[PDB]
Amino acid sequence: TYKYVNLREPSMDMKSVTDRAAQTLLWTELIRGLGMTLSYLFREPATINYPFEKGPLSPRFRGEHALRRYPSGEERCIACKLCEAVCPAQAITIEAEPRADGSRRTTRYDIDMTKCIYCGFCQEACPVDAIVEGPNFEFSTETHEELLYNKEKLLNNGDKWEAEIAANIQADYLYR
Amino acid sequence: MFMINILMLIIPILLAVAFLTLVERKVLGYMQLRKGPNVVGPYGLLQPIADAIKLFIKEPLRPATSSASMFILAPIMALGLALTMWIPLPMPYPLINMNLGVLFMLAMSSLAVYSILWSGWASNSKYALIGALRAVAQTISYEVTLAIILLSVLLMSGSFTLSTLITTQEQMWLILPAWPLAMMWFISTLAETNRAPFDLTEGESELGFNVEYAAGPFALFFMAEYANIIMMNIFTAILFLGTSHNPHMPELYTINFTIKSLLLTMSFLWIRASYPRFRYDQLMHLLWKNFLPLTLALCMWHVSLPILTSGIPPQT
Amino acid sequence: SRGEYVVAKLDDLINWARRSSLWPMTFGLACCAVEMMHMAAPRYDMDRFGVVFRASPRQSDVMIVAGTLTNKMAPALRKVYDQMPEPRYVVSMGSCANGGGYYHYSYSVVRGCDRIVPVDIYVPGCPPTAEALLYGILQLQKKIKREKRLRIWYRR
Amino acid sequence: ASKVKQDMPPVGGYGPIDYKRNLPRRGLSGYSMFAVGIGALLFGYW
Numbered sequence: 001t002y003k004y005v006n007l008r009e010p011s012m013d014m015k016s017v018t019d020r021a022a023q024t025l026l027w028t029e030l031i032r033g034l035g036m037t038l039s040y041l042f043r044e045p046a047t048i049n050y051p052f053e054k055g056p057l058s059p060r061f062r063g064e065h066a067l068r069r070y071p072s073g074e075e076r077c078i079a080c081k082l083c084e085a086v087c088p089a090q091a092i093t094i095e096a097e098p099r100a101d102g103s104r105r106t107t108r109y110d111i112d113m114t115k116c117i118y119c120g121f122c123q124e125a126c127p128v129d130a131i132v133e134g135p136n137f138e139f140s141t142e143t144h145e146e147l148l149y150n151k152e153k154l155l156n157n158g159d160k161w162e163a164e165i166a167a168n169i170q171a172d173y174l175y176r
Numbered sequence: 177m178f179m180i181n182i183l184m185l186i187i188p189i190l191l192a193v194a195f196l197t198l199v200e201r202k203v204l205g206y207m208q209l210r211k212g213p214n215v216v217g218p219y220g221l222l223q224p225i226a227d228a229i230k231l232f233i234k235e236p237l238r239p240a241t242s243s244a245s246m247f248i249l250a251p252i253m254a255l256g257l258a259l260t261m262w263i264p265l266p267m268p269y270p271l272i273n274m275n276l277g278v279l280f281m282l283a284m285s286s287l288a289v290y291s292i293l294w295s296g297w298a299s300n301s302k303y304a305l306i307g308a309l310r311a312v313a314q315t316i317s318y319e320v321t322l323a324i325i326l327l328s329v330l331l332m333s334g335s336f337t338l339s340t341l342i343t344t345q346e347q348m349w350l351i352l353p354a355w356p357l358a359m360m361w362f363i364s365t366l367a368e369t370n371r372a373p374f375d376l377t378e379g380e381s382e383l384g385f386n387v388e389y390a391a392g393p394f395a396l397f398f399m400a401e402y403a404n405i406i407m408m409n410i411f412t413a414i415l416f417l418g419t420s421h422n423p424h425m426p427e428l429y430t431i432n433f434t435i436k437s438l439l440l441t442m443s444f445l446w447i448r449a450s451y452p453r454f455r456y457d458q459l460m461h462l463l464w465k466n467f468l469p470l471t472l473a474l475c476m477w478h479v480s481l482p483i484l485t486s487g488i489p490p491q492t
Numbered sequence: 493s494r495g496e497y498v499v500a501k502l503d504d505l506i507n508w509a510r511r512s513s514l515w516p517m518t519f520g521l522a523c524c525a526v527e528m529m530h531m532a533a534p535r536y537d538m539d540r541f542g543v544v545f546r547a548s549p550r551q552s553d554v555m556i557v558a559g560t561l562t563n564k565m566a567p568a569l570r571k572v573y574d575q576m577p578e579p580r581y582v583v584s585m586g587s588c589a590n591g592g593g594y595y596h597y598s599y600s601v602v603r604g605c606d607r608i609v610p611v612d613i614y615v616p617g618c619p620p621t622a623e624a625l626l627y628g629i630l631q632l633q634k635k636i637k638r639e640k641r642l643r644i645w646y647r648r
Numbered sequence: 649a650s651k652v653k654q655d656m657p658p659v660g661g662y663g664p665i666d667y668k669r670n671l672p673r674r675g676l677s678g679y680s681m682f683a684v685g686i687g688a689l690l691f692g693y694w
């Protein structure tokens with residue numbers, strides 16, 4: 001089905017023709033537009049008072065990558081390199097070797113936060129919920145070099161945001 | 177004491193222009209469902225002061241102008257004339273009580289085109305010149321209707337004295353007998369001051385002439401432009417919304433007259449937020465094909481109407 | 493009064509004026525320009541901080557690079573930067589401008605705008621939220637607040 | 649025994665949603681607009 005948008009025939013009776021003469025001379029439809037802007041002048045603005053108020057987000061929000069631990073304190077990552085394989089930007093670099101106790105653990109875990117497209121594939125591929133994107137979105141820097149995270153920066157983030165990260169994963173893991 | 181009088185007129189004008197920038201940004205904001213400046217001082221009352229200091233300690237460009245003397249003459253002329261158009265305004269007593277004050281304001285207003293033309297030359301850019309030519313052609317075209325409309329109104333007043341317009345409207349506003357002229361006077365003032373929907377200069381995607389100016393020199397063009405917006409709306413209120421004058425309580429006149437002058441200045445900001453922009457060939461046709469035929473016809477009507485009713489005003 | 497006291501307060505007056513009236517020139521090159529428009533939208537309203545929506549290159553104090561800088565576009569960017577009257581700051585918005593992002597290994601993309609012009613603030617994300625760019629702008633304000641131009645001239 | 653729970657519309661569906669253009673009609677006719685305008689002029693001249 002279809003409909004015409006602009007296929008009307010204006011009437012040519014005297015009253016209709018005089019109606020358009022009053023509109024042309026007395027600027028009726030222009031003053032109709034002034035009234036609409038006047039109404040918005042008396043509506044409550046939608047502005048929020050940042051930084052004291054924040055915009056609503058959801059548990060699925062994708063922000064600053066981070067490395068998590070088990071409740072015992074042991075790292076969750078076991079250097080499987082699935083995240084490094086799936087990262088469409090090749091923003092992840094990993095090196096691993098047997099640990100002193102024989103565990104499969106990384107010796108390098110870097111994310112280039114300037115190559116990263118903040119897509120979330122790294123946390124979908126992870127089989128042990130080790131690399132996650134947290135809820136922090138305010139981490140702008142003053143130099144380019146502060147955005148090249150290494151394993152120490154990522155483990156510090158995980159310890160720093162674990163209280164909020166765990167609650168979000170609790171709220172959404174039933175959809176995953 | 178006269179020298180004190182001049183300063184009591186100049187400084188408040190500049191302060192009014194300074195806080196008009198704030199009011200414009202906040203009225204536009206609320207018509208757009210937002211707030212506007214409310215962080216720099218309470219309700220953004222220090223925003224104008226921050227902007228002024230920032231511009232005057234920012235390095236200016238001063239490109240390789242073809243003259244380098246027109247580049248400095250243009251803002252002097254613009255600001256110098258903008259302040260001069262205030263001296264005959266009765267509020268309710270003029271600083272200078274001219275007999276031909278209405279004609280003085282036309283004369284000084286027609287000289288403001290040079291600052292537009294000179295700054296075009298100084299920029300040394302061929303394209304910047306084209307923008308100056310379009311702005312100049314707009315200003316001269318729409319001051320044809322300012323002169324004829326003003327003449328039509330004065331036929332019901334009897335003189336070019338600005339304070340006689342107060343006496344003329346001692347029983348009724350001139351908006352009532354001459355509302356068709358008021359409509360075309362109000363729109364003609366928007367075109368003169370390059371205001372939306374007539375701002376092709378500031379209307380990017382088609383052109384402005386004051387593009388090479390930054391810092392203090394740019395602010396001088398800005399201040400002159402906004403002082404003309406207040407002045408023309410003060411002229412309109414005197415012309416079409418006469419305020420009764422009580423010689424024993426002159427402050428009563430000033431309060432009522434200021435409120436009208438503000439409401440007409442806010443109408444300029446209201447109209448900017450509501451409409452799109454005219455095309456260059458379309459605002460020229462709005463003048464040479466719509467306003468001018470009506471203005472000429474109404475001029476004939478207003479020359480004859482006083483005669484055929486026995487209502488010619490006194491010469492004095 | 494001491495000279496070191498007048499200079500300290502004069503530095504605070506010029507810093508206050510400069511950080512309270514940042515007029516940005518936005519280079520909207522790619523998707524990151526959309527998020528920059530949402531910072532001007534009613535929800536966040538950059539204008540209420542003194543940050544005007546649009547400014548011309550010669551009336552502007554900060555350049556926001558929002559999108560992918562290609563090799564065919566780089567000379568135009570440097571030209572606009574050189575014509576900005578000083579003081580001038582550059583904010584790098586998004587992964588593309590910071591380091592090339594998703595197109596880092598492309599033949600036609602400059603790997604980071606910081607090898608074409610100096611950069612003061614890097615805003616990460618792809619794209620950064622409109623509340624993340626706003627946080628970066630307010631971080632540039634505090635950086636300007638720490639400037640001590642007059643206190644260093646007085647000790648020369 | 650726990651039933652399946654996923655986002656679903658309420659029983660009976662959601663209420664109706666308006667989508668058509670609704671620019672209403674306001675103001676007087678051309679004849680009356682011109683009558684009021686001429687009337688104002690006549691009083692002004694008098």
Ligand SMILES: CCCCCCCCCCCCCCCCCC(=O)OC[C@H](COP(=O)([O-])OCC[N+](C)(C)C)OC(=O)CCCCCCCCCCCCCCCCC
Pocket residue numbers: 024025026027030031351356358359360362363373412416447462466467470477685689
């Ligand atoms: C008894 C004797 C009586 C004698 C006098 C009788 C007079 C009868 C009435 C005559 C008509 C009245 C003249 C009205 C002016 C018409 C001008 C015109 O050209 O109209 C067509 C023009 C253009 O007409 P057009 O573009 O639609 O088309 C023209 C013709 N064709 C189709 C061939 C191209 O309208 C405009 O002027 C455009 C307006 C631009 C936007 C202005 C924004 C308006 C904002 C609201 C301001 C409200 C006024 C505020 C005043 C405040 C004052 C204090």
Ligand SMILES: CCCCCCCCCCCCCCCCCC(=O)OC[C@H](COP(=O)(O)OCCN)OC(=O)CCCCCCCCCCCCCCCCC
Pocket residue numbers: 191217218221222225
């Ligand atoms: C008409 C234009 C012509 C005049 C040009 C303008 C000059 C007059 C301006 C008057 C208002 C400014 C008052 C005088 C200057 C004093 C400002 C000042 O010293 O504020 C200090 C205070 C911060 O000081 P401190 O805490 O010690 O430093 C911490 C640094 N991290 O700063 C603070 O944060 C305190 C918070 C209050 C600061 C703002 C002052 C109140 C705002 C008043 C608004 C009304 C005045 C503006 C409108 C009229 C125009 C002048």
Ligand SMILES: CCCCCCCCCCCCCCCCCC(=O)OC[C@H](COP(=O)(O)OCCN)OC(=O)CCCCCCCCCCCCCCCCC
Pocket residue numbers: 484485690693694
């Ligand atoms: C197709 C029709 C086109 C329209 C035709 C003309 C319409 C009728 C005239 C109105 C238009 C002209 C404007 C005249 C303004 C007059 C204002 C008014 O109406 O006031 C009436 C007033 C009342 O008397 P007043 O003096 O106030 O009483 C107190 C004395 N102590 O008394 C006065 O004001 C003084 C009297 C003024 C009379 C002037 C008009 C006479 C014209 C001849 C009448 C015939 C109309 C023309 C016909 C040909 C049209 C082509």
Ligand code: SF4
Pocket residue numbers: 065086087088089090091092111115116117118119120121122123133
């Ligand atoms: S969010 Fe996507 S692009 Fe960024 S590190 Fe994770 S997988 Fe790589």
Ligand code: SF4
Pocket residue numbers: 076077078079080081082083084094122125126127128129130131
């Ligand atoms: S997918 Fe998880 S476990 Fe595997 S290397 Fe990446 S972070 Fe470590």
Ligand code: SF4
Pocket residue numbers: 522523524558559560585586587588589593594617618619620
């Ligand atoms: S950083 Fe992301 S959102 Fe911004 S331009 Fe590049 S791909 Fe688009």
